Amino acid sequence: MDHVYKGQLQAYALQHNLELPVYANEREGPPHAPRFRCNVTFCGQTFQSSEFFPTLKSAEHAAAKIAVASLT
């Protein structure tokens, strides 16, 4: 999985002059069944996917993907 979403959101906020973005980190699930649910708060909006990623950063990248898409 790539990690360009963060670079885009950061540039978007700065370019548009908006309060810095905030990410949320959640980890819960058995050893062989770990789930990382990360939420992204932007412009007073928390976007989240209906699917759980097997990795932490994976959640952040996907989180921004839906977030940046909402803005445009």
Curated annotation (Swiss-Prot):
Tissue and organ distribution: Expressed in roots, leaf vasculature, shoot apical meristem (SAM) and developing anthers.
* Domain DRBM, first and last residues per copy: 4-72
Q: Which residues form a coiled coil?
A: none
Q: Where in the cell is it found?
A: Nucleus
Superkingdom of this entry's organism?
Eukaryota
Gene deletion effect? Elongated and downwardly curled rosette leaves. In old plants, rosette and cauline leaves and flowers change to red color. Increased levels of ARF3 and ARF4 transcripts, targeted by TAS1 and TAS3, respectively.
Question: Could you describe the subunit structure of this protein?
Answer: Heterodimer with DRB1 or DRB5. Interacts with DCL4 and cauliflower mosaic virus (CaMV) transactivator/viroplasmin protein. Interaction with CaMV transactivator/viroplasmin protein inhibits RNA silencing ability of DRB4.
Q: What does this protein do?
A: Double-stranded RNA-binding protein involved in RNA-mediated post-transcriptional gene silencing (PTGS). Functions in the trans-acting small interfering RNAs (ta-siRNAs) biogenesis by binding and assisting DICER-LIKE 4 (DCL4). Required for DCL4 activity. Required for the 21 nucleotide ta-siRNAs production of the TAS3 transcript in leaves but not in flowers. Plays an important role in silencing RNA of both DNA and RNA viruses. Involved with argonaute 7 (AGO7) and RDR6 in turnip crinkle virus (TCV) silencing. May not be directly involved in viral siRNA production.
Task: State what protein this is by name.
Answer: Double-stranded RNA-binding protein 4
Gene behind the chain: DBR4
Q: Which residues of the full protein are shown?
A: 1 to 72 of 355
